[PDB]
Amino acid sequence: TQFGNKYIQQTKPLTLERTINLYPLTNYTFGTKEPLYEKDSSVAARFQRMREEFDKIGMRRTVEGVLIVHEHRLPHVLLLQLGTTFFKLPGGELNPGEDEVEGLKRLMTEILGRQDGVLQDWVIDDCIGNWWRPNFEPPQYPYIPAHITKPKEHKKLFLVQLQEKALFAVPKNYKLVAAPLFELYDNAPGYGPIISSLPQLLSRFNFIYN
Amino acid sequence: TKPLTLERTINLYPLTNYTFGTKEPLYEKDSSVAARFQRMREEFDKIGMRRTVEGVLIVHEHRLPHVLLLQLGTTFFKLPGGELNPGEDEVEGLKRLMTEILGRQDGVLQDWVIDDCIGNWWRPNFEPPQYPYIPAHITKPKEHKKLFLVQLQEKALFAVPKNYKLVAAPLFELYDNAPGYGPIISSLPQLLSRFNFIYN
RNA sequence: UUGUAU
């Protein structure tokens, strides 16, 4: 309208400047819930299950959420530690035909969703990267390698935007840590290729401290 | 349908769609590493933090993304880009730089399509180290580098200064190869993984 | 520490 106030919006397109709110770690409350044990009792049991499942429902589709907070204006990724030395992002396997984002909201709620009844919604608007697994082996890559026509798994990473305050419940078998970016950066020996390239995957975001 | 924040579709075209001529050499303002950091200090005191922008132009070959790199010698590769002028707009500046380095000289309008930021790197000191985040307690970074995805038109003519060679590097060549390309180019594969690339 | 460019 030319007969009224102009409500000024961010000028650059969201493709060019994507602004994201980070709140302090101390804004969040953490509790404990029942342990979530893995579907696989060992490595062998797991690439075996991965082969079997591949034959009768196709390529495995995984989604994972990157949750970010800050401490004195420095971004930290929330990582689940499966006992000493092993870290994973929240997320997991999509059901057949399941929407990626609906699937990740499902999985975020299972792993970290509060128990006390206060409903906790997840804001998931951004894809931050993609990883493919060309064989039934541990190795993954941020592209589909040459001559790979039937990748065995496809993993999609998403930025999960947190509310100003929230309560999370951590399954008993896990510890939650907040890893600063300098800790992840150039540290594949500590976190693997996927987690340790998060700093890079996060660098395009214009973070707001609060 | 899907927010361009959730899904970003980009059209790639074959390398052969593009033809590469040459023009007169375009020499860097600094002739050595030593002079580069010397000039970084002057301009720092004078006009403040260096604002640098660079362009990632992608093509495909048999359905695999290749990034175009300017090879200055047998061991050094750079992305099209450069230093912004004080106050100058980032995308406007980047367009200016891409035309200097790669713009055809046959009078034809070359319009660069720059819609997407793909990363940021900061240089805390007047030394080589760059990080994809402002490191802890660095209040005054000396350089801020910003990377953009440039969507190429369907066919184009580019003119490469006789002192550079343009190359198309497949992602598997860049990935896990900081030793060959540095920390910035060698992580373009990760930075590019989010895009849904259409082959044509 | 991808760096001098015949």
UniProtKB/Swiss-Prot annotation, chain A:
Its main location: nucleus. GO terms for molecular function: chromatin binding; histone deacetylase binding; identical protein binding; mRNA 3'-UTR AU-rich region binding; mRNA binding; protein homodimerization activity; RNA binding. Keywords: Acetylation, Cytoplasm, Differentiation, Methylation, mRNA processing, Nucleus, Phosphoprotein, RNA-binding. The gene is NUDT21. The modification Phosphotyrosine is found at residue 23. Transmembrane segments: none annotated. Changing residue 141 to A: Abolishes interaction with CPSF6. This is Cleavage and polyadenylation specificity factor subunit 5. Component of the cleavage factor Im (CFIm) complex that functions as an activator of the pre-mRNA 3'-end cleavage and polyadenylation processing required for the maturation of pre-mRNA into functional mRNAs. CFIm contributes to the recruitment of multiprotein complexes on specific sequences on the pre-mRNA 3'-end, so called cleavage and polyadenylation signals (pA signals). Most pre-mRNAs contain multiple pA signals, resulting in alternative cleavage and polyadenylation (APA) producing mRNAs with variable 3'-end formation. Residues 64-143 are annotated as: Necessary for interactions with PAPOLA and PABPN1. Homodimer (via N- and C-terminus); binds RNA as homodimer. Component of the cleavage factor Im (CFIm) complex which is a heterotetramer composed of two subunits of NUDT21/CPSF5 and two subunits of CPSF6 or CPSF7 or a heterodimer of CPSF6 and CPSF7. The cleavage factor Im (CFIm) complex associates with the CPSF and CSTF complexes to promote the assembly of the core mRNA 3'-processing machinery. Interacts with CPSF6 (via the RRM domain); this interaction is direct and enhances binding to RNA. Interacts with CPSF7. Interacts with FIP1L1; this interaction occurs in a RNA sequence-specific manner. A motif (Nudix box) lies at residues 92-113.
